[PDB]
Design an enzyme around this catalytic site. Sequence first.
Site, short mmCIF file in Angstrom:
data_model
loop_
_atom_site.label_atom_id
_atom_site.label_comp_id
_atom_site.label_asym_id
_atom_site.label_seq_id
_atom_site.Cartn_x
_atom_site.Cartn_y
_atom_site.Cartn_z
N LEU A 143 0.83 -1.21 0.00
CA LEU A 143 0.00 0.00 0.00
C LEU A 143 0.87 1.27 0.00
O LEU A 143 0.53 2.24 -0.67
CB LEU A 143 -0.95 0.01 1.21
CG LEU A 143 -2.05 -1.06 1.18
CD1 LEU A 143 -2.65 -1.27 2.56
CD2 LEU A 143 -3.15 -0.71 0.18
N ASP B 74 -1.28 6.12 13.24
CA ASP B 74 -0.06 6.10 14.05
C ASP B 74 -0.23 6.85 15.39
O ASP B 74 0.73 7.44 15.88
CB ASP B 74 1.13 6.71 13.27
CG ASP B 74 1.42 5.99 11.98
OD1 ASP B 74 1.07 4.79 11.87
OD2 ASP B 74 2.06 6.61 11.09
N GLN C 72 24.75 -20.60 -15.20
CA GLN C 72 23.32 -20.97 -15.21
C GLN C 72 22.94 -21.75 -13.95
O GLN C 72 23.77 -22.47 -13.40
CB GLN C 72 23.02 -21.83 -16.45
CG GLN C 72 23.28 -21.13 -17.78
CD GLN C 72 23.04 -22.05 -18.95
OE1 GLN C 72 23.53 -23.18 -18.99
NE2 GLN C 72 22.30 -21.58 -19.95
N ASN D 182 -0.66 11.83 8.16
CA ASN D 182 -1.33 10.92 9.09
C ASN D 182 -2.87 11.10 9.09
O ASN D 182 -3.53 10.48 9.92
CB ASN D 182 -0.81 11.10 10.53
CG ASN D 182 0.66 10.80 10.72
OD1 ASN D 182 1.36 11.52 11.41
ND2 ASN D 182 1.13 9.65 10.24
N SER E 285 5.31 5.87 8.82
CA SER E 285 6.26 6.09 9.91
C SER E 285 6.63 4.77 10.57
O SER E 285 5.74 3.95 10.84
CB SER E 285 5.68 7.04 10.95
OG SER E 285 5.43 8.33 10.40
N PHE E 286 7.94 4.52 10.77
CA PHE E 286 8.52 3.34 11.43
C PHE E 286 8.49 2.05 10.56
O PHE E 286 9.09 1.06 10.97
CB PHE E 286 7.83 3.03 12.79
CG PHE E 286 7.69 4.23 13.69
CD1 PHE E 286 8.80 4.84 14.25
CD2 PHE E 286 6.44 4.79 13.94
CE1 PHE E 286 8.67 5.97 15.05
CE2 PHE E 286 6.31 5.93 14.74
CZ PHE E 286 7.43 6.51 15.29
N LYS F 163 0.49 15.15 11.49
CA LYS F 163 0.74 15.91 10.27
C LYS F 163 -0.29 15.49 9.19
O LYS F 163 -0.95 14.46 9.37
CB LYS F 163 2.19 15.66 9.79
CG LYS F 163 2.47 14.21 9.45
CD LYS F 163 3.96 13.84 9.52
CE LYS F 163 4.13 12.34 9.59
NZ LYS F 163 5.51 11.91 9.24
N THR G 223 7.94 17.15 8.47
CA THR G 223 7.78 16.93 9.92
C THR G 223 8.07 18.22 10.68
O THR G 223 7.33 18.55 11.61
CB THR G 223 8.69 15.80 10.41
OG1 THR G 223 10.06 16.17 10.22
CG2 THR G 223 8.40 14.48 9.71
N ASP H 234 3.61 13.28 16.53
CA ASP H 234 4.03 13.49 15.14
C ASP H 234 2.82 13.66 14.22
O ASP H 234 2.86 13.21 13.08
CB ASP H 234 4.88 12.29 14.69
CG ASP H 234 6.11 12.09 15.54
OD1 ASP H 234 6.89 13.05 15.70
OD2 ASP H 234 6.30 10.96 16.05
N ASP I 249 2.43 23.52 -15.31
CA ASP I 249 2.22 24.19 -16.61
C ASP I 249 2.62 23.28 -17.81
O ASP I 249 2.47 23.70 -18.95
CB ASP I 249 2.99 25.54 -16.67
CG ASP I 249 4.50 25.44 -16.48
OD1 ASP I 249 4.97 24.44 -15.89
OD2 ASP I 249 5.21 26.40 -16.86
C1 9YJ Z 1 -1.35 5.50 3.16
C2 9YJ Z 1 -0.54 4.40 3.83
C3 9YJ Z 1 -0.23 3.31 2.81
C4 9YJ Z 1 0.77 4.97 4.36
N1 9YJ Z 1 -1.35 3.82 4.96
N2 9YJ Z 1 -0.99 4.14 6.25
C5 9YJ Z 1 -1.72 3.56 7.14
S1 9YJ Z 1 -1.15 3.64 8.82
C6 9YJ Z 1 -1.35 2.04 9.57
C7 9YJ Z 1 -1.45 0.87 8.84
C8 9YJ Z 1 -1.27 -0.35 9.47
C9 9YJ Z 1 -1.02 -0.42 10.83
C10 9YJ Z 1 -0.92 0.76 11.54
CL1 9YJ Z 1 -0.44 0.71 13.21
C11 9YJ Z 1 -1.12 1.99 10.94
C12 9YJ Z 1 -2.75 2.76 6.30
C13 9YJ Z 1 -3.95 2.05 6.52
N3 9YJ Z 1 -4.45 1.82 7.74
N4 9YJ Z 1 -4.68 1.66 5.45
C14 9YJ Z 1 -4.23 1.94 4.23
N5 9YJ Z 1 -3.11 2.60 3.88
C15 9YJ Z 1 -2.42 3.00 4.95
#
Ligand code: 9YJ
Length: 451
Positions: free
Chosen positions: A14, A152, A326, A136, A18-19, A133, A171, A131, A397
């Site tokens: 996806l 998060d 190979q 999030n 963060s982390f 922003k 950030t 954090d 543009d």
């Molecule tokens: C946009 C991005 C790909 C960064 N993203 N971020 C989240 S944050 C999340 C996703 C999974 C576990 C935890 Cl602890 C937080 C998340 C989510 N829930 N569903 C779809 N996409 C997600």
Amino acid sequence: TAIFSDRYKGQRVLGKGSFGEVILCKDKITGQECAVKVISKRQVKQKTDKESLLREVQLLKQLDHPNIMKLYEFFEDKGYFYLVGEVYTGGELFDEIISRKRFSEVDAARIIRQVLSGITYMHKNKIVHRDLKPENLLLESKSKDANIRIIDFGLSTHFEASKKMKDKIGTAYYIAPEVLHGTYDEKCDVWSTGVILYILLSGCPPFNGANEYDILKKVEKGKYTFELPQWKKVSESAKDLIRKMLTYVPSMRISARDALDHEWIQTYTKDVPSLDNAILNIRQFQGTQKLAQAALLYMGSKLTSQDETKELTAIFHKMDKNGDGQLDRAELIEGYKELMRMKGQDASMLDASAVEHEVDQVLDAVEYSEFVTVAMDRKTLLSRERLERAFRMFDSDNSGKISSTELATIFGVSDVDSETWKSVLSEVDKNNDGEVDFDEFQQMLLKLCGN
Ligand SMILES: CC(C)(C)n1nc(Sc2cccc(Cl)c2)c2c(N)ncnc21
């Protein structure tokens, strides 16, 4: 102790959060789709002990609010943490605001009323974001009237923030001054929301600069103004709320609860012209932030692909007994899995079955030297096209070029030293036109990461 791979399987990547990386996973029995954040123990350090993390995870699972992400399960192994929760498909809030034609104080009030409703709820349960922003703030679904979900929440308390600039984009604008000095409480989230509200109504951050340290300097001083011409079309009550939300001393700063009862939130949610100058500035800001991030992730992906190309070539060379260049299908699987056992397991590769499938996808197109080239080009495939797509969106543009002033802003947000990119520019642009195309821009990024 339960195993993650026994309950869930990876479907598609996806994105990056963060982390750690976020993966679309599916339950192997019920078929429920879920988003999983994979935090690597080697790359991310723990701020607390195991018993403290398990107690907060247990609490976070029992909490429920329409504007807070729902967490379902938590798993752990020798080198990873797997946070499993609800998946949202509406995308980031700012990516949606730039696509819509009109935007006013009623839309901004409806956004911040949800963000405050979530923050107020999480503050009563003694959980702080820190954090917060726009990145999030995800939208629950692909609809016009979609609820916002804060992601998060509480992870900053138990996991240390990254010092790599590819993980610190956007950030410094939203971080509260008290978080920089060490003494902070839940009021830091009100400041972060106050900054988001300031950008929604003007499209420019209140504390800005030509680099990360210059932004933090303005934030630390805490001075900002409503002197831009676009603030004349905005109401006085919207400015009063921002003044109360961006109060330097946290004890004097308004709470999340009292921000909901403010005259601006009560009047604009229960004439209102469109803020055309604000949308154009949010569109420019979002494009600049995304191109800077795509540049750092492109440079990062290239460096990891060189390391993995030489490592995967060294593994297959040792496995090649006769030395004909190979190998068999079963051998290539053992070698590709060995790369993950030595250089850490991949986020997409959840188990041994995911590796066997990825190897078969390479063999459909693709001699182990030819297998490495294809297998490693698929890893960067996402980061290469994301850079081109981000360059095309930034070039609003459609001139095909990016000016020197724009490069300074882009590299400024990426925190690349002024004299370093100007020196790299001269190696490709030897006629000094003060502008570069996509190929030349990509060549600059390649030269900045040792190529
Ligand atoms: C946009 C991005 C790909 C960064 N993203 N971020 C989240 S944050 C999340 C996703 C999974 C576990 C935890 Cl602890 C937080 C998340 C989510 N829930 N569903 C779809 N996409 C997600």
